[PDB]
């Protein structure tokens, strides 16, 4: 038999509730470039002070998940979560650990699929900046005031995340004053950058294509007298380049149409190989020295093209 | 101990309930051409006036999700939703914010998979018109009357949606009088067009095929005396075209059989390349000038074909 | 405080319950040839007469989903449903609209994955007959008697279904007397045929292969003197045919092994192309007129083969 | 107000409960070679005798799913189920039909994903023996004694199962005495064999490869004088074989690494084709009759290889 | 009517609860290299002593899943579980079997998707060490003390696990003292290694590539006089190698970018084949004995490369 002495939010009217958040990223996975999202498991720890549960004697009361519904808990929500759930492995992953002075420790295990934009302009050399924002979904700023428990180091576990492709290169936590239709709210934003592994992509596509085109333009040293050999090398290189392009197109079936960087490099290599074939034909027609078109023509143009490519994907 | 004074719909008998809807599209994703649907997360805000909850003093009562079931809430439903759920991240995403004069603000976070037809006649240059209709699923028009809170600008967040392929080019909200078996209903329709990104598809397929066929028909300037060179160019171009067609067929495994536009263009390019091969054979047979069949034959026919293609996909 | 006056099925003992069913197919999608099923969203309207809820005054009582559990509702089930759920978008999609004389209108929004056999003997020219059967799962025929409200026109919405591949060509509703172990039951069967779109498949595979083989057998008009040209055409056609076959094998990765029709046609085309190559070799050996083997040999055999193919896929 | 007279298991102490099981396989689908499982929908009928619900008068009481929780029901579980659920289409699929003498008929509609090993040593000619075991998960043998209602014919519906690939060739039901840590249990095992459709796989891979190699070794009758023709046939056959192998590798992307049978046959065909090429080179070198290496060399070795292959996949 | 005599954890204050865990892995499946996880079904048996449920007479009380919530059960959780659920096949898979002296046997059937890192540096010859850690999620070490019932042999069923690719080669159970923010905890870790099946991968890629390159470098014994034969062999081998590389790239579409071992070996084979082509051209240019570059050049370099490869993937 309880009335208004157990249901109202702490300090209902007056000073807002100071809720201190602590985060512990257990894992990050299912980062899809098609849906532009990421799945992460986090340990959401919330600490606030309530004046109505002061009990004598210094000790802790680790409550179960069944008694969580009997007390007041914050209404934190992930701002851009597309699908999420609280873990129920054997019991409910909801603990409340009350303390003598009224400190409440509310810990949850939540798997969230947050939505972050994948600006895949430079597909293999991109650092996607994805955030995990937490906000009091119902209560405005004047009612609930979110805060980070220990500044930047409140979020833990991100330094141990080594993923299939990405590596965390930076992370920082900030508190904002997000304004929307309902009113003023405090949003706790955790911002981390997912730098891709360029080394695998370099050896997968850039190194083979570079070696192929190098073999193509060093074949000009072979004299025009050996026509069938030159035709064989040209045909084999062109066919290998086409097969590589087709396989690369089929290798990653991601729904992320943003005219990527591998497309540009592959188009450059295809341009150089079929231009080498066309210039073989044109050189035969004009002869009616082939290495004069290699000593200072082809490797130099490809070097300039690579310089422009790397300048594009290096600076702004 | 409550009877009929708390369960009945507001103004039960007489003037219908004027419910004002406000929408906030958080994200749009999972747009599949196979299933012809789209997944969107929205903030459904409903505002109506109830005369039985007038409390003295100007203030707001931000209720939790547990007290939502104790009051009357509308029965809004998405007309063509295939699968949807209300978000439960930490607590229920259902708030009721009562006001002094009886205004009720009912906000929900719902992820919906609505079904919209994908008329993929022009696959890379289509603007799919997909709607998100909201209706009082049980109560007819004479009982519940839906309305947009602020006309066209009631829906927010659609201008910030940049997706993997599509870009929103238009959006407008209207109220209808949908007639069905149960009776008369008010349907709130939000109509938005998803224009595709043609630039990526142009460079992916149209530019390479155009360059290949251009190289094919400019090789007629090469004299018939260099037979092996011509056979090499023709064979390489035909093989490259076939590999490109096969890769394109395997590149997008979408279950959207509508004889698309890329199929038509690829068939045109394949027709031109194998016709070039056949005309090489026929030209040899008839010679028993090859550039006479290029100066005003092949590029001109391809130009006419491209003109017809673009006229088809430009106007009606 | 209610006993047996509110829990028992209407007319418990005596005349069975006459429940009239009305169906409204909202959408049909996710038709997979591998799992041999289809996902459909339907509006299940059930109308029966109950004598214990007669209230004075002509009017309707549109009840919510919370009061559905307080009254008796039928136990209709989809006979071959593999996975299904009732929609919960904002509230429960369960309405009961009582009337003065005891008529009860029970409407639900259900998404069902029913299992129907995909006899893919003729893969592109098949009309799969898939049913959506509804039955009183627990109560036998002597207890609950299902009926269609308005005969064939009880089911609505099927005429507006235009899908990715299939088009509805027929639909009809019937009532059966299905016999099983538990007893006698009334099953309401809705039978619809999903005719495939042959036009897309014709232009995708049949037209290119036909053009390729036509080019192959019209090359016999080219004299045997131009040996390298003939070898080039033969090699290019054979390679194109092999690539088309491989791409088609990889194009549709459906788990529906039924030796389909496209396989037969593709095998016929492959047989003709490699037979053309073999007959080139044999013709050279025997010459030691090639068009004598084309004027009345090859196109005529292919015409007979196509006649047999179309006769197989036309009649029985 | 009920105590121990309604909650205890029937015959608590003394003779164990004789529960007779009847099974009705509605469908079998989603048989994945990667996860090594199968999804099946079954009608689990359980019949036992309870002495505490004897009511006068011969009649049946078809109870709803809401009253199932008020009575005692067995704790049957599928032994190797990975994920399963009870169907809730419109109401709960749980009926209890009590009878005069205490017979209880408990019928459920359950979709189960049971795990069965896929020994894919002979991928296209395998008969996987997968079981569907049912056991009293909590109560041991001395408490609950499972039994089949009518021996082998208790399981019904398996004879009407025609699947995408497999065909049921045998089925039998047995009762065991499975021993585990908790104690002695009675396990009801339904064992069925899923024989694959070899006819589709024969025509898909074996027939084309056999025809290709036959064409390869009958080309030895062509004299060595026609060198370019022989090189053309050899190159075309080798390229076709390589493309077929690559497509087959990409055709089935199943995660079932068990060095299958199609791999062995394809390796044999690849060995024969590149050996034919190598022997062309070696025959030219040694000539410095080619059909002497065909009359009694190549088709005979391939015949011996096929004999060994079929002996391996025929007997032990 | 119960107060604090039935809700508190056993021995609340003083000696911690000694909970003995027993594990029974029913199945392991869905091991994905992309998400770096594994799905396993386990039988979690927990044994502890409670002093408040001592009943006279030696016997067992096998309680149902409905009475589990009425007693105290541990809060065990899987540390790195991404998604998990307790099985509900017919009833709840939660049994409590009390005994005379207070022993409680709590058995559950849980399907867990635990996250373990897939260090795919050596893709076909890796032994991934994945753990299944169980911990008292809420209560610290001073409150709940986890223990293995019978040391290493507490975990059962792992010896019968034969999977699609991996084979368990080792398994061991240990108890730790994991330290985190909340306090001191006892973590029960089961560590097992999943050794891959190298035999399938050897015959799939290593054997064909080795045979191809062997045929390539034994063709040097063929004299330079037979130029067209050498060009044919070289072109066929290069095309076969390129097709094999492309198919392998498309064969496994796993999102596990870690520059794997098959990539290195395939790059080595591609290097050798196109180097053989380049050296054919260079040998022709320099001749202006080819087997002098085979007797002690090519097979020896490939042997050294394979020695280095196997030394890398053998030792450290
Ligand atoms: C009963 O009490 C209610 C609460 O006190 C009253 O509701 C208020 O009604 C007034 C006008 O009638 C609202 O003022 C408007 O509010 C709009 C929405 O905030 C404003 O729009 C601006 O802000 C939005 C959100 O930022 C922008 O999207 C938009 O583009 C524009 O910039 C208007 O400019 C205007 O201020 C007020 O907000 C309402 N408050 C609430 C809490 O709903 C109601 O009128 C009372 N009724 C009676 C009969 O007295
Ligand atoms: C008990 O009270 C009930 C409610 O008052 C009575 O139900 C009504 O019964 C009459 C006929 O007995 C129904 O009239 C018909 O309704 C059909 C469905 O609306 C109409 O069909 C037309 O409309 C539908 C829907 O738009 C179209 O799909 C269809 O093609 C056609 O155009 C008929 O034309 C006809 O009007 C009436 O609708 C019923 N009302 C309800 C609410 O169910 C019932 O008869 C009473 N019983 C007794 C014994 O008195
Ligand atoms: C207590 O009361 C119960 C209900 O009144 C009694 O159950 C009945 O028991 C008799 C025999 O003891 C059953 O008769 C048999 O039923 C079989 C199943 O229906 C029949 O099999 C035939 O039909 C099935 C289903 O169509 C076919 O699959 C099968 O191949 C075959 O063709 C038998 O042929 C035979 O009739 C009767 O069905 C039971 N009824 C019910 C409702 O269970 C029970 O015996 C009573 N016990 C005592 C001790 O009196
Ligand atoms: C309180 O009462 C409890 C129940 O009466 C007592 O539990 C029993 O404790 C004894 C030993 O203390 C257990 O005996 C052992 O049980 C092991 C597990 O069954 C056996 O292992 C063998 O069997 C397992 C399972 O088949 C194999 O996996 C294993 O390899 C080996 O072959 C041992 O060999 C030995 O018998 C007994 O099982 C317990 N019974 C139960 C129901 O738990 C408890 O001791 C009592 N405590 C006190 C203080 O009196
Ligand atoms: C009310 O009672 C509460 C409980 O008794 C009090 O909370 C304690 O507050 C003190 C300081 O005010 C905390 O001490 C700090 O705790 C930090 C977190 O443990 C420590 O950080 C170190 O440990 C963490 C975790 O291992 C590391 O991540 C971190 O990098 C660093 O190494 C600090 O160093 C410091 O000890 C104490 O932990 C709090 N205890 C609990 C249970 O919350 C509260 O202050 C009381 N309030 C009043 C007004 O009296
Ligand atoms: C640490 O927090 C401060 C705010 O106190 C912020 O300015 C700073 O940027 C944070 N550190 C990093 C690395 O972002
Ligand atoms: C804005 O709303 C009006 C109705 O008041 C409608 O006519 C108009 O079309 C809307 N605007 C747009 C851009 O559609
Ligand atoms: C319409 O219903 C009748 C039964 O009254 C049935 O015989 C007929 O076949 C149905 N119409 C069609 C097109 O099937
Ligand atoms: C039928 O059941 C008997 C047991 O009574 C068993 O021996 C027999 O093998 C079963 N039939 C088949 C075909 O297995
Ligand atoms: C068995 O347990 C002991 C601890 O008592 C541990 O040291 C040992 O390593 C375990 N066995 C194996 C094979 O790991």
PDB file of N, CA and C and ligand atoms in Angstrom, chain A residues 180-181, chain B residues 47 49 99-103 105 149-150 153 156, ligand 1:
ATOM      1  N   UNK A 180      14.875  19.874 -29.374  1.00  0.00           N
ATOM      2  CA  UNK A 180      13.887  19.267 -30.255  1.00  0.00           C
ATOM      3  C   UNK A 180      12.510  19.809 -29.884  1.00  0.00           C
ATOM      4  N   UNK A 181      11.474  19.212 -30.479  1.00  0.00           N
ATOM      5  CA  UNK A 181      10.116  19.718 -30.307  1.00  0.00           C
ATOM      6  C   UNK A 181       9.650  19.609 -28.860  1.00  0.00           C
TER       7      UNK A 181
ATOM      8  N   UNK B  47      -1.570  14.387 -30.500  1.00  0.00           N
ATOM      9  CA  UNK B  47      -2.099  15.422 -29.622  1.00  0.00           C
ATOM     10  C   UNK B  47      -3.610  15.488 -29.783  1.00  0.00           C
ATOM     11  N   UNK B  49      -7.462  16.433 -27.265  1.00  0.00           N
ATOM     12  CA  UNK B  49      -8.008  17.112 -26.096  1.00  0.00           C
ATOM     13  C   UNK B  49      -8.983  16.183 -25.390  1.00  0.00           C
ATOM     14  N   UNK B  99      -1.604  18.160 -19.817  1.00  0.00           N
ATOM     15  CA  UNK B  99      -1.519  19.594 -19.590  1.00  0.00           C
ATOM     16  C   UNK B  99      -2.782  20.072 -18.885  1.00  0.00           C
ATOM     17  N   UNK B 100      -2.782  21.359 -18.530  1.00  0.00           N
ATOM     18  CA  UNK B 100      -3.827  21.898 -17.666  1.00  0.00           C
ATOM     19  C   UNK B 100      -5.204  21.805 -18.313  1.00  0.00           C
ATOM     20  N   UNK B 101      -5.304  22.133 -19.598  1.00  0.00           N
ATOM     21  CA  UNK B 101      -6.594  22.194 -20.272  1.00  0.00           C
ATOM     22  C   UNK B 101      -7.038  20.851 -20.838  1.00  0.00           C
ATOM     23  N   UNK B 102      -6.238  19.800 -20.666  1.00  0.00           N
ATOM     24  CA  UNK B 102      -6.582  18.483 -21.157  1.00  0.00           C
ATOM     25  C   UNK B 102      -5.806  18.018 -22.370  1.00  0.00           C
ATOM     26  N   UNK B 103      -4.818  18.784 -22.825  1.00  0.00           N
ATOM     27  CA  UNK B 103      -4.008  18.366 -23.961  1.00  0.00           C
ATOM     28  C   UNK B 103      -3.135  17.180 -23.571  1.00  0.00           C
ATOM     29  N   UNK B 105      -0.101  14.635 -24.939  1.00  0.00           N
ATOM     30  CA  UNK B 105       0.978  14.438 -25.900  1.00  0.00           C
ATOM     31  C   UNK B 105       1.470  13.001 -25.772  1.00  0.00           C
ATOM     32  N   UNK B 149      -0.885  18.245 -37.404  1.00  0.00           N
ATOM     33  CA  UNK B 149      -0.792  19.336 -36.438  1.00  0.00           C
ATOM     34  C   UNK B 149      -0.530  20.672 -37.123  1.00  0.00           C
ATOM     35  N   UNK B 150       0.412  20.703 -38.063  1.00  0.00           N
ATOM     36  CA  UNK B 150       0.841  21.947 -38.694  1.00  0.00           C
ATOM     37  C   UNK B 150       0.971  21.781 -40.202  1.00  0.00           C
ATOM     38  N   UNK B 153       4.418  20.885 -42.700  1.00  0.00           N
ATOM     39  CA  UNK B 153       5.618  20.895 -41.876  1.00  0.00           C
ATOM     40  C   UNK B 153       5.468  20.073 -40.602  1.00  0.00           C
ATOM     41  N   UNK B 156       8.837  16.016 -39.850  1.00  0.00           N
ATOM     42  CA  UNK B 156      10.174  16.579 -39.762  1.00  0.00           C
ATOM     43  C   UNK B 156      11.207  15.465 -39.859  1.00  0.00           C
TER      44      UNK B 156
HETATM   45  C1  LIG F   1      -3.834  23.961 -23.875  1.00  0.00           C
HETATM   46  O1  LIG F   1      -2.528  23.946 -23.307  1.00  0.00           O
HETATM   47  C2  LIG F   1      -1.509  23.588 -24.253  1.00  0.00           C
HETATM   48  C3  LIG F   1      -0.207  23.528 -23.488  1.00  0.00           C
HETATM   49  O2  LIG F   1      -0.069  24.636 -22.610  1.00  0.00           O
HETATM   50  C4  LIG F   1      -1.477  24.587 -25.410  1.00  0.00           C
HETATM   51  O3  LIG F   1      -0.563  24.106 -26.389  1.00  0.00           O
HETATM   52  C5  LIG F   1       0.251  25.179 -26.891  1.00  0.00           C
HETATM   53  O4  LIG F   1      -0.380  25.854 -27.988  1.00  0.00           O
HETATM   54  C6  LIG F   1       0.392  26.931 -28.543  1.00  0.00           C
HETATM   55  C7  LIG F   1      -0.454  27.559 -29.626  1.00  0.00           C
HETATM   56  O5  LIG F   1      -1.826  27.220 -29.475  1.00  0.00           O
HETATM   57  C8  LIG F   1       1.727  26.401 -29.059  1.00  0.00           C
HETATM   58  O6  LIG F   1       2.509  27.481 -29.558  1.00  0.00           O
HETATM   59  C9  LIG F   1       3.077  27.104 -30.833  1.00  0.00           C
HETATM   60  O7  LIG F   1       3.923  25.971 -30.683  1.00  0.00           O
HETATM   61  C10 LIG F   1       4.506  25.508 -31.901  1.00  0.00           C
HETATM   62  C11 LIG F   1       5.206  24.195 -31.611  1.00  0.00           C
HETATM   63  O8  LIG F   1       6.135  24.410 -30.555  1.00  0.00           O
HETATM   64  C12 LIG F   1       5.455  26.601 -32.411  1.00  0.00           C
HETATM   65  O9  LIG F   1       6.068  26.164 -33.619  1.00  0.00           O
HETATM   66  C13 LIG F   1       7.476  26.491 -33.594  1.00  0.00           C
HETATM   67  O10 LIG F   1       8.219  25.507 -32.877  1.00  0.00           O
HETATM   68  C14 LIG F   1       8.267  24.190 -33.472  1.00  0.00           C
HETATM   69  C15 LIG F   1       9.062  23.297 -32.539  1.00  0.00           C
HETATM   70  O11 LIG F   1      10.311  23.927 -32.276  1.00  0.00           O
HETATM   71  C16 LIG F   1       8.885  24.295 -34.869  1.00  0.00           C
HETATM   72  O12 LIG F   1       8.919  23.009 -35.466  1.00  0.00           O
HETATM   73  C17 LIG F   1       8.043  25.245 -35.725  1.00  0.00           C
HETATM   74  O13 LIG F   1       8.575  25.320 -37.044  1.00  0.00           O
HETATM   75  C18 LIG F   1       7.950  26.622 -35.071  1.00  0.00           C
HETATM   76  O14 LIG F   1       9.265  27.177 -35.150  1.00  0.00           O
HETATM   77  C19 LIG F   1       4.657  27.903 -32.645  1.00  0.00           C
HETATM   78  O15 LIG F   1       5.523  28.949 -33.073  1.00  0.00           O
HETATM   79  C20 LIG F   1       3.860  28.315 -31.398  1.00  0.00           C
HETATM   80  O16 LIG F   1       4.800  28.795 -30.450  1.00  0.00           O
HETATM   81  C21 LIG F   1       2.466  25.684 -27.938  1.00  0.00           C
HETATM   82  O17 LIG F   1       3.666  25.102 -28.431  1.00  0.00           O
HETATM   83  C22 LIG F   1       1.585  24.594 -27.340  1.00  0.00           C
HETATM   84  N1  LIG F   1       2.268  23.930 -26.242  1.00  0.00           N
HETATM   85  C23 LIG F   1       2.242  22.606 -26.059  1.00  0.00           C
HETATM   86  C24 LIG F   1       3.006  22.093 -24.877  1.00  0.00           C
HETATM   87  O18 LIG F   1       1.628  21.858 -26.813  1.00  0.00           O
HETATM   88  C25 LIG F   1      -2.859  24.743 -26.034  1.00  0.00           C
HETATM   89  O19 LIG F   1      -2.857  25.807 -26.978  1.00  0.00           O
HETATM   90  C26 LIG F   1      -3.903  25.025 -24.960  1.00  0.00           C
HETATM   91  N2  LIG F   1      -5.234  25.092 -25.543  1.00  0.00           N
HETATM   92  C27 LIG F   1      -6.132  26.022 -25.204  1.00  0.00           C
HETATM   93  C28 LIG F   1      -7.455  25.943 -25.904  1.00  0.00           C
HETATM   94  O20 LIG F   1      -5.889  26.888 -24.370  1.00  0.00           O
END
